[PDB]
Design a protein around this nucleic acid. Structure first.
Ligand SMILES: [Mg+2]
Ligand SMILES: [Zn+2]
Ligand SMILES: [Zn+2]
Ligand SMILES: [Zn+2]
Lengths: 180, 43, 264, 114, 65, 160, 196, 133, 86, 773
RNA sequence: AUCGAGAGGC
């Protein structure tokens, strides 16, 4: 995203533009595009060298002026404490990989285990494509009854993982039974 | 298949270590295990 | 009524029965429920020979599904096990043969239901092998979906079976067991952050029994003979018949032990 | 591949004696009975009824491995009481209780209207 | 690829319920939980077998051969 | 250091001792200065300790350093194993590295040296040297396929 | 393996009657050990079980998306509305005994993925097998039906054990045993020997 | 044969401890200055009070398998509420002519003071502890 | 060096059999039992060659010579009956 | 190198391993298909023709079968193809390749071969399923886990080879490690957890469960234990059934913390004759380490008894644990709200202190540590503040967490769990470290492009206030990812370095064995050690013991060890010795006592010289204390009766015992001197352990009990001496190697890089350092 | 065969 002075510095995008994006999205009239957002100048493409000169905020909500009881369970977030922000990151989760986007809660878990799961998910069985029965691949493994995961990342809809799941939502008990 | 289609390979002064420059462009945690860890990354 | 264990049924249904067992050792109750899961004999398809497979689902997949489909087994005790029978592969006394051939002329995908599926072998005057459909539409469980221009032809040989041998032959899906709902026996110790009463909800079975007064000491001698159980039926065998057959099959195992002792 | 078929666990084979009786060593009235193709279900009930009997000093049920459905019961009785006699009385008592429960449930179900 | 016949934990048949459940949620705009309650799949394992399942059979049907 | 010394009574008491730690080591100059006990001073590098104090002091320092490596993890290895390694380097008058040069130069054997590294160069120099192998070594006997005179093979068995 | 770090091979398959059962009667399709979890420090597996239970009863998909503010207390409160325990510990009874387990046991819906590795493809055993000609050694791989490599590290372990005969058999009789004839006067195997 | 020792003890304090089922018992001999006692008791099996006088007895009897009690053959070894069987972990002397006796029954521990009962206490491991209300 | 006999009186070696020595003696005797060579000791209830070799060793019936070797090459010969087993 | 050192081997198999509790530790579960594949040649013998003919008739597919029959002529007979297989007769001298059968020796090995313990011989058991089966304890020497680890089995092909694996490579023999003087294998995971939960005094066992557990022990006395509680209800302690598991005649006393004999905390253990008097079983009693119950049982009863004990404890504890159950759960990670607020204020106060130190740095009014750059000192202080904050938050969480929650239950049992684990999940992950530094500014003056320039605050530098439960900020997650990435790179690097090291050590030390003279020599014969371990003794059987003369007051040592027959106070009390009335005066016996006291004084001075620390406990050949305890129970010693033993006889017997133990045989003056040197410390320990006053006072000792103690000490020392022909060098190389693999890496070269520099004589030092005294 | 790539278990 791009953040420039409105007045009070504001993210360049606006709710009405998001509403036009949603209007183009439900249609599957005026057509509103990501390329159209770039031509509008609401969003810019940043290289690492360009990244050094910018100041960016993770949350659009952080930018709006802040001047309250807080639930203990929510993670402690350091106040941004910065008056100038050239841009705002679209979402933190976008830093992640596709395999990381598959991982349920990398935020609540230790990163090496997330790395191991990112490696393991490629090994995990699933339906790779619908053309498989037509296709003649040297080795193919396809689950009998693939089940979409109960807890899904938002990014998964762009991953099509819910559409083509690679796991079963097994009922799991954590217990010691006969030492196996 | 999607992850394989987006791969980076660096043929080989601390390449393996995750870089602040890597933020927002490369996955923080996806790398081949053991040998060549961080040499190959996913975007 | 009869001396010994006495059962008062709270609720009745064709699918499920809710009862209270009194003057019962818990060992026998758990043994009974495990018998109902496992020992009760029921007939589901053991052999599937498919003539044509145009549909995308593979034959192994379809055959597993067909084995899962419920088949009526009230007279299954009249039926003799195929291993116990004399015929080399199948006879009418031991096996019931169900044939199904479906082709979809409709451009819309044609369903393949359990109600479609028909019996070749003679009934011999017993209520065996009829697929059970509880659906309001009467449509059977859908084995497959057929694109236009696809035909599937199969023969099924359904034999008497044991749930310990395969899960399809089990008559009952869920048995609900409750004992010591007030935790007077204190067989379990609760995990509570502040208070156990808040952490764990009270049971309905808990409110049936009287509440423990806080002043009375725990009695070591008491062993709970009162249990709250519910049984849910697939419908291959009616609920009351499933529980009676559990009792009878446990009796049969005990009697087998006794006769083996006499032979020894 | 390697695994044994489920029916073999279900039913006896190779002329297996359903019950094998071996005198326990170092105990006068104790005996080990091997039940083959039998499960925890029957064993716990036999043991519970043996424990109910005053004469039997010891009764315990053990399975050597979950893979194989072999169940071993050891019975230690009062002197002058056959361990087999105790086992038979316990089994018969089990049967009487089961029959009484089935009659009570049948009467109750006939009373039940649905 | 197809609706499972039974919940794997219970063994209760769930194949008959799937088509009617899809209808129910369509006609009443029902939240999935209420439709499952109408189905009678109170146990969350039968509920998982219905909700988590996706019919990939339609995609195979779309293929002409 | 907070070290511990016998008390006048005899019980082990602890007295703090001031100690200096130096980034560099010039031990020959360092020992010959006022205000230091020459005996107590130690250098973390065993090589300076060996040059200053002889080979046995260097061996003791080497064992101490290996002991520090094992102790930092909290792991313990019995003194004889670490000792045997240190003694192996120490028995030759000059300290001998575990790496190929130190281990290979020892004129003992031919196929152990070739088995570690530079197999073919060692065989070439051995052919030029006309080295005759005793074949007593474990490795050489493994190449030979004969049973090594090791463990069970060490003692011959004869009729009574 | 779970969608989190921890992976496992199945050591045994248990029938439903044997498995511990709740009052609802739900039997876990899978049982995992409690001990691995603390060392792995994967809280999210636990959180996923809780959220999936809440979602299964609610009929609404649970969002696990990272960096989204969630209350484990909130999810536990929804579970409380359902009546299931906020921690998700479920009172279970052991199958064989029918006795209530003294400790309530965590019971959840967890996504699990079948790994590509399966035993039957891995298991290879050879008593006698094909031999590569030049080495006279065994061939390599299960498809070759070849014998497994004896490690030099393994050889050192055996020398430490001190058993010379086992090493001699594995080193010659099990692999590339050979008979040669050599002349003493040559010092080299120049001799060519016709036994007939 | 006969009870080794008999005493009446008044318990000054009962400590719940880390264990809920088992609480510790600190008591002094009633009317006697020399005996002190520390006991490990199960409050669920026996109600205990912060102040209470409980009759305390130790008996050698009343390689044998424990026989389940049949009311006919069983002569009550005691009307005492609590009976435990223990093996002494240590016999020591706090001061000369002041013997201290330590008895552990199923990992539940016992401490006694005094000399006048040292002849009553024996090296023999077997002991039966008897608490009367 | 050659015929480097070590005197029977003037022997310095552990009286106790080395565990490797006992293992090798048992293996050789068990080969002889597998070879069906006659076994001096009476055999009750065991077919296995190793059990027979162990029973012969406990009886000390096995006649064999274990020759302890030295770096110099001088050889000490100890009869299996002589070496202590513990 | 590739072929001769390492060969593809016939009769080799490999499978995924899953562990089995009901399978004994010694045996390996072997798949029926693998057992069918693998053949052992057996020559036909009059006792074996009957069973072998039946096996040949059974055929290749049947498990008790044969694949091939070898004629005396030797032409191969393939059973499956030949028409003869039905009608064969086995003439004498004809080999038959038996199918691998139960209770046959094989070699089970994990491919990382850091240790001879990692490849050990196991008895064949035949299992129906395909996965190799193993016990849970035997996992630890193998360093294998059930998550897809694959293990290799090799079959002996001759009777001598089977004999070697059974007599030396067996699991019970390798239970006690030569190195680290500790048993390799201990009770692990649920069993261990369960055992503590069984041993709590609150835990009590009901008679049905008591009988079933008694039955569960494979060998049971048949005598029901007398109930711990009788009158209210028949109750049995979990320690009581556990005692039924413990072998009779075993005594263990240990106090982890100072234990009153009353033991209200139940810390420590006392066990007598296999019956546990007091304590809750923890890891160290049941762990691999020395002083564990495994070590004591292995030495006293032999190895097989120890392995069976392993099995029995596993069975009983697993049955109990299944009845109680276990579950980690979310709530264990969850902590109370008030404690959480105290955690947050801890983080806040640490943040304020960091800001104050930063402000002082900005003011340039600063104190510089000598030789540290001012930024270096500031960085060190801030890092230390963050570390203390994390640890303090973890400690508050630990106090908050109940005894009941299962994570703490695992920690108390010693199951998987760490204080850092609890701290990071509960309160605060901590500050991420890359290259021994706080998170660097990859962007100029910015750690992250969101973070402002020139910010040295912990949030910029990557300290994670949030816990794993709390959820992490995206910046926190990225910093944690960098730290974990460096960790994984370091792990793989460590593996490669350690493998090369271990190979170098093994190749260097492979030649050296203990020869018959006890000199450790290579093949050429250069003596690395004149006596192995500088004591001429085996690494095994040595356990650390306290030497009494070292330490303590000199006057106190006099009071304990000095009896002077002439002075009335000095003289042994007549109640202690019958000879006491005659021992007053008796000046010749008194000069012998003076001689023993002078020798003890010389020994004390010598020990004071060996260790300036003079720490009491060092590895020692024979544990005298165990022998004394076994004597007291064996001889039923009563403290009242005066000792039968003559004082002169005690002193002379101790000297005779010193004369009895010879590391090296024969009488040569150099050999005699080396022998006195070898047994100098052992004799010092023995003189301290058997003082005439101590023999008479500390324990009453009948004369026969003292003679038995002497004979047992002699036998134990002789057993402890190193066996000639043992390959010391390979074992030593592996001994450094396996910890080195396990090794994980104010500033000095440390860990694996330090070990690198030590192992190769290095001209350079990354951190030279001279200590100035 | 040869070479390469990928994966597993640390
Ligand atoms: Mg693993
Ligand atoms: Zn028939
Ligand atoms: Zn269900
Ligand atoms: Zn020639």
């Amino acid at each position: 995203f791009i953040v420039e002075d409105d007045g009070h510095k504001e993210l360049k995008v606006r709710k009405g533009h998001i509403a036009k994006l949603m209007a183009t999205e439900y249609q599957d009239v005026e057509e509103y595009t990501w390329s159209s957002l770039l031509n509008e100048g609401l969003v810019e493409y940043i290289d690492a060298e360009e990244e050094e000169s910018i100041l960016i905020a993770m949350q659009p909500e952080d930018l709006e002026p802040a001047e309250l009881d807080v639930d203990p369970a929510k993670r402690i977030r350091v106040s941004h404490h910065a008056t100038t922000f050239t841009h705002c990151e679209i979402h933190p989760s976008m830093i992640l990989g596709v395999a990381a986007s598959i991982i349920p809660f990398p935020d609540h878990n230790q990163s090496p285990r997330n790395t191991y799961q990112s490696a393991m998910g490629k090994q995990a069985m699933g339906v790779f494509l619908t053309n498989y029965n037509v296709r003649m691949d040297t080795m193919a493994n396809i689950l009998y009854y693939p089940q979409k995961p109960l807890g899904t990342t938002r990014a998964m809809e762009y991953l099509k993982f819910r559409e083509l799941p690679a796991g079963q939502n097994a009922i799991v008990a954590i217990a010691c039974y006969s030492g196996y | 298949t999607l992850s394989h289609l987006r791969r980076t390979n660096t043929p080989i002064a601390k390449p393996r270590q995750l870089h602040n420059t890597h933020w927002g462009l490369v996955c923080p945690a996806e790398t081949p295990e053991g040998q060549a860890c961080g040499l190959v990354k996913n975007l | 009524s009869e001396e010994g264990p006495q059962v008062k049924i709270r609720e009745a249904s064709k699918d499920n029965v809710d009862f209270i067992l009194s003057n019962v050792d818990l060992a026998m109750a758990n043994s009974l429920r495990r018998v109902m899961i496992a020992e009760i004999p029921t007939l589901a398809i053991d052999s599937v020979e498919v003539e044509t497979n145009t549909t995308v689902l593979a034959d192994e997949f379809i055959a597993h599904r067909l084995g899962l489909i419920p088949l009526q087994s009230m007279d299954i005790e009249q039926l003799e096990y195929s291993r116990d029978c004399f015929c080399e592969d199948h006879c009418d006394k031991c096996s019931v043969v169900l044939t199904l051939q479906a082709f979809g002329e409709s451009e819309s995908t044609t369903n393949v239901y359990s109600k479609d599926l028909v019996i070749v072998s003679n009934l011999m005057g017993r209520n065996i092998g009829h697929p059970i459909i509880q659906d309001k539409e009467g449509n059977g469980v859908l084995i497959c979906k057929l694109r236009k221009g696809q035909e599937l032809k199969l023969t099924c040989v359904a034999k008497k079976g044991i749930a310990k041998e395969h899960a399809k032959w089990g008559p009952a899906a869920a048995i609900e067991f409750e004992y010591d709902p007030w935790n007077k026996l204190k067989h379990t110790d609760y995990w509570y952050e502040q208070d156990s009463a808040k952490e764990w909800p009270q049971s309905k079975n808990c409110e049936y029994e009287d509440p423990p007064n806080e002043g009375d000491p725990f009695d070591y001698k008491a062993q709970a003979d009162t249990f709250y159980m519910n049984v849910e039926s697939v419908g291959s065998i009616p609920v009351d018949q499933v529980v009676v057959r559990g009792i009878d099959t446990l009796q049969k195992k005990v009697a087998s032990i006794l006769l083996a002792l006499t032979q020894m | 591949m390697n695994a044994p078929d489920r029916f073999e666990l279900f039913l006896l084979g190779e002329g297996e004696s359903k019950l094998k009786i071996d005198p326990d060593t170092k105990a006068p009235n104790a005996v080990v009975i091997t039940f083959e193709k039998e499960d925890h279900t029957l064993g716990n009930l036999i043991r519970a009824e043996l424990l109910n009997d005053r004469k039997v000093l010891f009764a315990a049920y053990k399975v050597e491995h979950p893979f194989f459905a072999r169940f071993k019961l050891r019975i230690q009785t009062t002197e002058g009481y056959d361990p087999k006699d105790a086992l038979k009385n316990a089994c018969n008592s089990i049967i009487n209780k089961l029959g009484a429960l089935k009659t009570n449930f049948e009467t109750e179900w006939n009373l039940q209207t649905l | 690829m197809i609706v499972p016949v039974r919940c794997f934990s219970c063994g209760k048949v769930v194949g008959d319920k799937w088509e009617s459940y899809l209808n129910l949620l369509q006609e009443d705009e029902l939240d999935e939980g209420t439709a499952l309650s109408r189905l009678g799949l109170k146990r969350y394992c039968c509920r998982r077998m219905i909700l988590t399942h996706v019919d990939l059979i339609e995609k195979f049907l779309r293929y002409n051969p | 250091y907070d070290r511990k010394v016998p008390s006048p009574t005899g019980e082990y008491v602890k007295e703090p001792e001031w100690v200096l730690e130096t980034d560099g080591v010039n031990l020959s100059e360092v020992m010959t200065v006022p205000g230091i006990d020459p005996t107590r001073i130690y250098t973390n590098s065993f090589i300076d300790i060996m040059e200053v104090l002889g080979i046995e002091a260097g061996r003791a320092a080497l064992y101490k350093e290996v002991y520090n490596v094992i102790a930092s993890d909290g792991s313990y290895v019995n003194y004889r194993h670490m000792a045997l390694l240190v003694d192996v380097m120490t028995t030759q008058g000059g300290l001998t590295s575990v790496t190929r040069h130190g281990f290979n130069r020892s004129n003992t054997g031919a196929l152990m040296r070739c088995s570690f590294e530079e197999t073919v160069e060692i065989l070439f120099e051995a052919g030029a040297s006309a080295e005759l192998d005793d074949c007593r070594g474990v490795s050489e006997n493994v190449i030979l396929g004969q049973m090594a005179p090791i463990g069970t093979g060490a003692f011959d068995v004869m009729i009574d | 393996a779970s969608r989190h770090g921890q992976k496992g091979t199945i050591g045994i398959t248990y029938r439903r009657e044997d498995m511990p059962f709740t009052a609802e009667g739900i039997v876990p399709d899978l049982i995992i050990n409690p001990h691995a979890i603390p060392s792995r420090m994967t809280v999210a597996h636990l959180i996923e079980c809780l959220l999936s239970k809440v979602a299964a009863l609610s009929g609404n998909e649970g969002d696990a998306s990272p960096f989204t503010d969630i209350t484990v207390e909130g999810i536990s409160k929804l579970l409380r509305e359902h009546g299931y325990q906020s921690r998700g510990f479920e009172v279970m009874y052991n199958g064989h005994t029918g006795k209530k387990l003294m400790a309530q046991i965590f019971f959840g819906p967890t996504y699990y993925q079948r790994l590509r590795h399966m035993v039957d493809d891995k298991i290879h055993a050879r008593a006698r097998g094909p031999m590569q000609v030049l080495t006279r050694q065994p061939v390599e791989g299960r498809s070759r039906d070849g014998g497994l490599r004896f490690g030099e590290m393994e050889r050192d372990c055996m020398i430490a054990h001190g058993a010379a005969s086992f090493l001699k058999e594995r080193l010659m009789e099990a692999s590339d045993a050979f008979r040669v004839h050599i002349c003493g006067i040559c010092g080299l195997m120049t001799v060519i020997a016709k036994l007939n | 044969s006969n009870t080794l020792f008999d005493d009446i003890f008044q318990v000054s304090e009962v400590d719940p401890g880390r264990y809920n089922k088992v609480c510790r018992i600190e008591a002094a001999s009633t009317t006697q200055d020399q005996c002190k006692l520390t006991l490990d008791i199960n409050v669920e099996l026996f109600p205990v009070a912060a102040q209470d006088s409980l009759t305390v007895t130790i008996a050698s009897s009343l390689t044998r398998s424990w026989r389940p009690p049949q009311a006919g053959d069983r002569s009550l070894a005691d009307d005492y509420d609590y009976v435990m069987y223990g093996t002494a972990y240590k016999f020591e002397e706090v001061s000369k002519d002041l013997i201290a006796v330590y008895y552990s029954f199923g990992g539940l521990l016992m401490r006694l003071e005094g000399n006048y009962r040292n002849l009553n206490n024996l090296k023999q491991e077997n002991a039966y502890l008897l608490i009367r209300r | 060096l050659k015929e480097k006999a070590i005197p029977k009186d003037q022997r310095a070696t552990t009286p106790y059999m080395t565990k490797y020595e006992r293992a090798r003696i048992l293996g050789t005797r068990a080969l002889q039992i597998s070879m069906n060579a006659p076994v001096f000791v009476d055999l009750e209830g065991e077919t296995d060659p190793l059990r027979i070799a162990m029973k012969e060793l406990a009886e000390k019936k096995i006649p064999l010579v274990i020759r302890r070797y030295l770096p110099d090459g001088s050889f000490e010969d100890w009869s299996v009956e002589e070496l202590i087993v513990d | 190198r590739g072929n001769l050192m390492g060969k593809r081997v016939d009769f080799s198999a490999r499978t995924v391993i899953s562990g089995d509790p009901n399978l004994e530790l010694d045996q390996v579960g072997v798949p029926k298909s693998i057992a069918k594949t693998l053949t052992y040649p057996e020559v036909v013998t009059p006792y074996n023709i009957d069973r072998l003919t039946q096996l040949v008739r059974n055929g290749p597919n049947e498990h008790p079968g044969a694949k091939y029959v070898i004629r005396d002529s030797g032409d191969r007979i393939d059973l499956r193809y030949s028409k003869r297989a039905g009608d064969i007769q086995l003439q004498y001298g004809w080999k038959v390749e038996r199918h691998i059968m139960d209770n046959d020796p094989v070699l089970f090995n994990r491919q990382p071969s850091l240790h001879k313990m990692s490849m050990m011989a196991h008895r064949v058991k035949v299992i129906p399923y395909s996965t190799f089966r193993l016990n849970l304890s035997v996992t630890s020497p193998y360093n294998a886990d059930f998550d897809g680890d694959e293990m290799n089995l090799h079959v002996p092909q001759s009777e001598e080879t089977r004999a070697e694996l059974s007599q030396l490579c067996a699991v019970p023999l390798q239970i006690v490690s030569p190195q680290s003087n500790k048993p390799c294998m201990g009770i692990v995971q649920d069993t261990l957890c369960g055992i503590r939960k069984l041993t709590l005094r609150d835990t009590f066992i009901e008679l049905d469960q008591v009988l079933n557990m008694l039955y569960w022990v494979p060998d049971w006395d048949g005598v029901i234990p007398t109930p711990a509680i009788i009158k209210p209800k028949p109750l049995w302690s979990g320690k009581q059934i556990l005692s039924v598991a413990i072998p009779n005649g075993i005594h263990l006393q240990r106090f982890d913390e100072g234990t009153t004999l009353l033991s209200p905390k139940d810390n420590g253990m006392l066990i007598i004759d296999g019956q546990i008097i007091f304590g809750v079983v923890e890891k160290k009693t049941v762990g691999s380490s020395n002083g564990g119950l495994i070590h004591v049982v292995t030495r006293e009863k032999g190895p097989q008894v120890c392995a069976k004990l392993f099995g029995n404890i596993q069975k009983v504890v697993n049955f109990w644990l299944l009845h109680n159950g276990f579950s980690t759960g979310i709530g264990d990670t969850i902590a109370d709200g008030p404690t959480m607020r105290e955690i947050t204020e801890t983080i806040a106060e640490a943040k304020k202190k960091v800001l104050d130190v930063t402000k002082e740095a900005q003011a340039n009014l600063l104190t510089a540590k000598h030789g540290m750059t001012l930024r270096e000192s500031f960085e060190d202080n801030v890092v230390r503040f963050l570390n203390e904050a994390r640890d303090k938050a973890g400690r508050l969480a630990e106090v908050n967490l109940k005894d009941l929650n299962n994570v703490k239950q695992m920690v108390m049992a010693g199951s998987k769990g760490s204080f850092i684990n609890i701290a990071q999940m509960s309160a605060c992950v901590g500050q991420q470290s890359v290259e021994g530094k706080r998170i660097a500014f990859g962007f100029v003056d910015r750690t992250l492009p969101h973070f402002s320039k020139d910010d040295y605050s912990p949030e910029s530098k990557g300290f994670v206030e949030n816990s794993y439960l709390r959820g992490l900020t995206p910046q926190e997650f990225f910093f944690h990812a960098m730290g974990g990435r460096e960790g994984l790179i370091d792990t793989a690097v460590k593996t490669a370095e350690t493998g090369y090291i271990q190979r170098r050590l093994v190749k260097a030390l492979e030649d050296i064995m203990v020869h018959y003279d006890n000199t450790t020599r290579n093949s050429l014969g250069n003596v690395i050690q004149f006596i192995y371990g500088e004591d001429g003794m085996d690494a095994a059987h040595i356990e650390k013991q306290s030497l009494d003369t070292i330490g303590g007051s000199d006057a106190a040592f006099e009071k304990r060890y000095r009896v002077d027959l002439l002075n009335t106070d000095h003289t042994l009390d007549p109640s202690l010795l019958e000879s006491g009335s005659e021992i007053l005066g008796d000046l010749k016996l008194q000069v012998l006592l003076d001689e023993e006291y002078k020798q003890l004084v010389k020994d004390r001075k010598f020990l004071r010289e060996v260790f300036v620390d003079g720490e009491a406990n060092w590895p020692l050949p024979v544990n005298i204390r165990r022998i004394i305890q076994n004597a007291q129970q064996t001889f039923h010693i009563d403290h009242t009766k005066p000792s039968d033993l003559t004082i002169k006889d005690i002193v002379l017997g101790v000297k005779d015992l010193q004369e009895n133990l010879l590391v090296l045989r024969g009488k040569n003056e150099i050999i005699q001197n080396a022998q006195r040197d070898a047994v100098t410390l052992f004799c010092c320990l023995l003189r301290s352990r058997l003082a005439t006053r101590r023999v008479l006072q500390e324990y009453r000792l009948t004369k026969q009990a003292f003679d038995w103690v002497l004979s047992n000490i002699e036998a134990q020392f002789l057993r402890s001496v190193v066996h000639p022909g043992e390959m010391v060098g390979v074992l030593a190389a592996q001994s450094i190697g396996e910890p080195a693999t396990q090794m994980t890496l104010k500033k000095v070269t440390s860990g694996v890089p330090r070990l690198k520099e030590i192992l190769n004589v290095a001209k350079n030092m990354k951190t030279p350092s001279l200590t100035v005294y």
